[PDB]
Design a protein around this nucleic acid. Structure first.
Lengths: 150, 84, 129, 142
RNA sequence: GCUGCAGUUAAAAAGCUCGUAGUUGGAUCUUGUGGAGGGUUCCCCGCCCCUUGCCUCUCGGCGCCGGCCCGAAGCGUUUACUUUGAAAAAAUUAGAGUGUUCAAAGCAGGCCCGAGCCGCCUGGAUACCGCAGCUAGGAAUAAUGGAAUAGGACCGCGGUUCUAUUUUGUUGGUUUUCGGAACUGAGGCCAUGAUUAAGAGGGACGGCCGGGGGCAUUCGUAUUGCGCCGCUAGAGGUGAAAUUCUUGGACCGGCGCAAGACGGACCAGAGCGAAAGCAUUUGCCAAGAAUGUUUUCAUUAAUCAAGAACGAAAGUCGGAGGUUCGAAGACGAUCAGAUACCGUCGUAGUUCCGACCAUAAACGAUGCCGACUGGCGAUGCGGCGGCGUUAUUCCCAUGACCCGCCGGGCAGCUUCCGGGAAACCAAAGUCUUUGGGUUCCGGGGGGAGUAUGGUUGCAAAGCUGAAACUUAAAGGAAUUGACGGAAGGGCACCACC
């Protein structure tokens, strides 16, 4: 199951077989696009974007009112970020850990957990960088972690 | 198990009370709802597990509340599914 | 993980037949499992079977009888060259008279008895009897 | 079971077996050759020596007897081996400071029967067998 | 022990986790009809769109009546696999033929005629030859391939540049033309190009949960010491004693203060943590599991040489502290002896801060990941459903109790699931009907974790690790006896009172 904990668990989303509209709805493909573009200005990232549509607007999902994903729509403009938010959130966490570690050198538990989250960055990086989604010279270090999260 | 039981055609909710990814076809256990209370006279549509505060444009500015699952509504009826 | 799908499949229908059952549920439905069970149905060891459809990969349900004694998998997949054949079938079958080693060839998936008449070797998958 | 069954795992099989074969007792003696160096034989079936002097060797319990062996130095190594003498009165047909021919018991490394410390026996005194000396179809050539 | 072994207790899973190499890895991209070969549909030509994908042609044949048609020429993105050919010294081996007197062998030999035939007939096969390389057919299986910041299609045109040497009979000066090649713009034509989201993983989001960790802070009683007050003779301790303590007074009772240590009862086959481990208050700092979700990414995974973090107690080095307990040591008893068990005193240590040390019955003596296969009642956490009591503000905020359902977690009970030598175990099950993936490790008992060299450490030692020689038993589970300064009953003047 879990990749750095021993646990096992199910909580996965389950989609219906259907996939019409379904009937009840509005905002033709085009309407949904301009509704999205406004949100990305405000710093709402693709995961947040689909949530804020699904909770309060008439969409089931933005993959059955468009022929594309949420991210590809943003990418066609050129307004997509230069690294995926997934990678960003890993790096975002580990800097605060390193701050706490400098403030407290006797928190061996934090030091331990850092080894996991550190190694999990490098594995993820080796997906993107082989697929030509990152430069083949980019590496993860303390210095590059500081600058890239800011 | 009686060790001979059917699995082709299940009971409407005595063999569809199971976990949603242990059913023959995967179904959600969630639904939408068409609302329109008074605090905000508009036909709003909202998902059952809100996950975030749904805002109002009327006198009120809150409609929901995200808890650990479904979402606690408020003093405004407005209910439907519809169909799904 | 679920490295090999076919290998996890047969053990269910093997276990189920022993206890005394006649309906099962096997997932996640590979095309390879379909053509296997087609050959196994012709000879008469199982009955008609229903493929449920999902977008994920499907699920299959089978109707079976006590005629089956055991179907096993042989993994990893070795080659046969129609002189290696006699050595394989001796070890894996209760008798010369019946039992059916299955394999895949460029002429499709079939029993060993058919492959010998087409002069086709290939990769072995499992067996049954 | 409990081990790899890959299709490209020929290396991981043939290197494992080559290591775990050395834990066998038999194999480890044959191929190191420490057998040859330690033995008073060169691996030869027999060997030849010259008598040093008769001895009496006590038996291991329950049995009690005196077993009348010899002790011998070898021609080609100069090291010493303690060797049993067979049937009754055959001790007399071995005389001190002559040559003899030795041979293993028939257990190929280990001391046999109730006699300890002996791993060798004696077959010919001087081109004449213990049999023909014992039975009386030959006589001492001296 | 690849086919084909074993690791709970018999020899045996690294203390634990991370991690590169290595090995292994989800689903998904075409079916019917006449003729021919075989049944009663089904397995060489074609047909629906495809059918050995195409063209373009031009040179050397086949045609039919200048004109037209179809074989050979480039090939279908690349491999493994499989099938057919080629090419493989003899002897040996398998094996055909042959009456060696039969045989082991050997390669021979057999026929008709008085010689008068001047001769006749016949053999000296065939198979096999790991690989790798060479050749041709198949297209299932397993890898690999393409247009998503567009270029595929057509003589579509422009802009720009280079070049080919043929012909006007030939040879020279010039210029276009034709062919090849290279580069640029704007426009048509494509159904104009994205498989799903694994009861795989990662990531976001929401409300919670826990003696999880770090830092700060707060509190309780006891113990010991000190001061003061009161009464008077013994007090400690043991099986029985004694050392020891005591009229400058102990022990005991009362009151206040100080020091250090420590978190009772509550506290449980309960919870959290990778393991080692983790219980007074309150706050701060970062972290994590489970559950909920019609959110996001789209195979990003599994297990692991190298290498890396953490790792009880004791011990070592440098500082602080030192109540309590206490190796060492000094005494008192018990004992023939008593360097012990027991009593008194007591150093190191025990505590904290900073460096080392890497080991334990670090034990569930039981690798990790995945699938399938009985029943029943509970408990901790989240979510959902419900005839009701119950809290408050009088009334569906969310609290407590009751009933049921769905996840994942610590466990239990039950049996001809099945297994095991048995003890036992829903896993140690799905194993002679043996193959899901992968790491580590074992080979009779001693010698020996010794010898030796390497490496790490200040020290203590840790890791890595033989042989000579010796021996027929060592060891596991279970059963019957005997025995017990084991437990429960009963009995005797050869037992006691």
């Amino acid at each position: 199951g879990r990749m750095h904990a021993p646990g096992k668990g199910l909580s996965q989303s389950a989609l219906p077989y259907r996939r019409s509209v379904p009937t009840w709805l509005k905002l033709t493909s085009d309407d949904v696009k301009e509704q999205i573009y406004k949100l990305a200005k405000k710093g709402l990232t693709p995961s947040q974007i689909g949530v804020i549509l699904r909770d309060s607007h008439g969409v089931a999902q933005v993959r059955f009112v468009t022929g594309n994903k949420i991210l590809r729509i943003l990418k066609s403009k050129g307004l997509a970020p230069d690294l995926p938010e997934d990678l960003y959130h890993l790096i975002k966490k580990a800097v605060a850990v390193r701050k706490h570690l400098e403030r407290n050198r006797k928190d061996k538990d934090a030091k331990f957990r850092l080894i996991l989250i550190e190694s999990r960055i490098h594995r993820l990086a080796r997906y993107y960088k082989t697929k030509r989604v990152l430069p083949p010279n980019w590496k993860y270090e303390s210095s590059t972690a500081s600058a890239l999260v800011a | 198990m009686p060790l001979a039981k059917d699995l082709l055609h299940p009971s409407p909710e005595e063999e569809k009370r199971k976990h949603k990814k242990k059913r023959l076809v995967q179904s959600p256990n969630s639904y939408f709802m068409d609302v329109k209370c008074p605090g905000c006279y508009k036909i709003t549509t909202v998902f059952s597990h809100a996950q975030t505060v749904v805002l109002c444009v009327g006198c009120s500015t809150v409609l929901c509340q995200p808890t650990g699952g479904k979402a606690r509504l408020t003093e405004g009826c407005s209910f439907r599914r519809k169909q799904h | 993980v679920r490295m090999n799908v076919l290998a996890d499949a047969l053990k269910s229908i093997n276990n189920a037949e022993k206890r005394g059952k006649r309906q099962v549920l096997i997932r996640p439905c590979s095309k390879v499992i379909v053509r296997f069970l087609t050959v196994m149905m012709k000879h008469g060891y199982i009955g008609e079977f229903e493929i449920i459809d999902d977008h994920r990969a499907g699920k299959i349900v089978v109707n079976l009888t006590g005629r089956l004694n055991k179907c096993g998998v042989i993994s990893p997949r070795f080659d046969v060259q129609l002189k290696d054949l006699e050595k394989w079938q001796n070890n894996l079958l209760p008798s010369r008279q019946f039992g059916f080693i299955v394999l895949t060839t460029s002429a499709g998936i079939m029993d060993h008895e058919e492959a010998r008449r087409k002069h086709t070797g290939g990769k072995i998958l499992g067996f049954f009897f | 079971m409990g081990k790899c069954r890959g299709l490209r795992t020929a290396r991981k099989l043939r290197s494992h077996r080559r290591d775990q074969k050395w834990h066998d007792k038999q194999y480890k003696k044959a191929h190191l050759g420490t057998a040859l160096k330690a033995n008073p034989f060169g691996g030869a079936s027999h060997a030849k020596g010259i008598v040093l002097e008769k001895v009496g060797v006590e038996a291991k319990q329950p049995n009690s007897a005196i077993r009348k062996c010899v002790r011998v130095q070898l021609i080609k190594n100069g090291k010493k081996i303690t060797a049993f003498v067979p049937n009754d009165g055959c001790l007399n047909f071995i005389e001190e400071n002559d040559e003899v021919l030795v041979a293993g018991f028939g257990r190929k490394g280990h001391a046999v029967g109730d006699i300890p410390g002996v791993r060798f026996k004696v077959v010919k005194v001087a081109n004449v067998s213990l049999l023909a000396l014992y039975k009386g179809k030959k006589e001492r050539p001296r």
